[PDB]
């Protein structure tokens, strides 16, 4: 019953939506999270994909989208809640 | 020893996929192990054919082997992986983690 | 309305051998039958076991041992905690 | 050796059920046997979790065992058996014979 | 897509039909047969159960209901076809 | 319309090792990919194999061997009978 902010830079590739509000759909008795993944390079921020995510251990009871990876190619953060795909940070 | 869903966390870092898997960097893929012996209880989820096979195994322990502790319920996991042209792609891989087990 | 092989768990079985992760005070919530097996493994030491069946395939697992290497006796009673006060004895 | 549905005819006459089984007096309950090894082909019907487990088995052959050759499709058979009060009863026992096999 | 003659002596026990025409229903890519089982005792014939039957090796391509068992308690014959439950015989 | 993991079998793969009960003139009708594995078992004798994948899980089975005890190389081509004229050689 979750809801995230769906964003996709490859909308023209697969004939999909570049943004919008995505209502989450998942299995029963299972939690549903939101995810945000972007590209950071020398102070420039370029979001690639935001949306829904199935049950995952890495984002249990997190109210914000904080990426803990130390300098990966694409930053990723998982958050449990409603509309937690609004903002993001790279605090490791 | 009995049919029991054991716990196993497999990390893509040691599976050589760290170059094309953005996240998750490792998920809990519980493996199923144990032994199935007569009788097959309520929790050891069994079929009619499993019971018939484990009954034939009683008389002929060499001709027919015992049923196998195998998964019965599976769940999908979301994977955000790279493509061949360095394109980020999300996919819900079905039948990845084990939720239950039983004699097959 | 609903098939007897997928019947709602109501029966209560007792627990000495086969004993699940969530049986409380040695009590299994089942839908088939209650069983008590007195198989003695090869070595003179004798064993005992009392537990809950899954009903599917019980027709095969509730007759006496037809022609098996060891000797076993399994009483299939459908009364709550009937396998409690049960002490079988293998017939020669 | 490979995942393959073998043939097995089990007769109720030697299973001690000849007193309460009018017909059939024995049916073909094909048992499933073989080994599952990398790679898992098209005919060796496999799941994503089976592939992941058999890939983890590559690096750690001791921690995690190989997937198991287990049935994937089953069929019911009709049985006309006696009751406890010598009453003839027909029942379609589900999941009795094996139609296919695969790595689980 | 088969059709057999459904007969049952225990109609009042399970609140069913004592006779009628039963349209067979079975799995795809599988054959469907008819079966007839009766009680014979010193020249007296008393049918117990006629109806449908799933795939069975014992009645491959048989156009009649002929019981091959040598003096069992309840005679049984399986036949492949349409309305083959009309007659029966005890030729072994 | 239909998922790529349950895609209609169309591709044609060749057959030297893993070879099904109904392949005609060593030809498998598949829906995933065509693969050619040059694993040599422990003993100096070397082996060869060419067959058809099931597409599900091929993403894992189509990269090079990450860290395995023996050495293997698997080329996943989607062209009809591409595994035919393929002779891989394990790199030191
Ligand atoms: C994209 O990458 C840039 C560059 O790495 C990130 O800027 C970094 O922002 C963090 C915010 O916590 C800065 O860390 C903090 O900075 C100051 C001292 O400079 C102080 O508040 C703390 O001690 C802490 O170190 C970090 O310095 C800064 N990096 C640079 C090179 O200036 C940015 O956050 C990234 N954005 C996203 C959306 O990932
Ligand atoms: C046969 O299938 C059944 C049904 O899927 C499996 O039963 C499941 O067993 C697990 C392990 O005990 C249960 O999880 C536990 O449940 C309660 C929740 O209050 C609690 O004790 C623990 O926190 C844990 O979550 C699970 O609920 C239960 N499923 C059902 C529907 O009751 C069984 O494990 C399978 N057999 C084998 C051999 O795996
Ligand atoms: C994986 O699942 C598939 C699909 O159920 C199994 O394929 C089946 O294989 C059998 C054995 O070869 C096929 O039966 C044969 O088919 C043709 C009919 O013209 C003929 O060669 C024989 O008379 C025989 O009946 C069966 O058709 C085939 N099923 C399908 C849908 O193609 C496969 O066996 C399973 N894997 C394992 C390891 O059992
Ligand atoms: C119910 O049981 C009675 C009694 O066993 C069956 O009567 C039997 O009918 C068969 C028909 O083939 C007779 O066999 C044939 O009989 C004559 C010689 O008597 C001849 O045509 C053949 O050489 C062959 O032996 C059999 O003799 C007869 N039994 C007796 C004791 O008279 C009857 O058929 C059974 N009915 C059903 C529906 O099962
Ligand atoms: C996906 O895209 C469609 C089509 O663009 C969205 O429907 C509306 O499209 C118009 C333009 O035609 C936008 O201005 C609107 O914002 C879109 N939304 C609404 C509510 O009118 C559609 O909503 C998008 N999302 C989904 C889930 O289909
Ligand atoms: C099962 O029994 C019902 C009810 O008896 C059958 O319906 C008709 O019932 C009347 C008596 O009420 C009989 O005289 C008729 O012969 C029955 N059939 C028809 C077609 O009218 C019903 O047909 C029986 N069979 C099934 C499959 O339901
Ligand atoms: C279980 O047993 C404990 C002590 O062993 C007792 O206090 C309690 O009544 C029992 N509870 C349940 C839920 O059976
Ligand atoms: C298979 O090969 C035979 C000879 O091996 C040949 O005559 C025939 O063309 C081939 N048939 C098919 C269906 O591939």
TrEMBL record, chains C, F:
It is found in: Cell membrane. It comes from the Eukaryota. Belongs to the protein kinase superfamily. TKL Ser/Thr protein kinase family. TGFB receptor subfamily. This is receptor protein serine/threonine kinase. The chain holds residues 49 to 140 of 532 of the full protein.
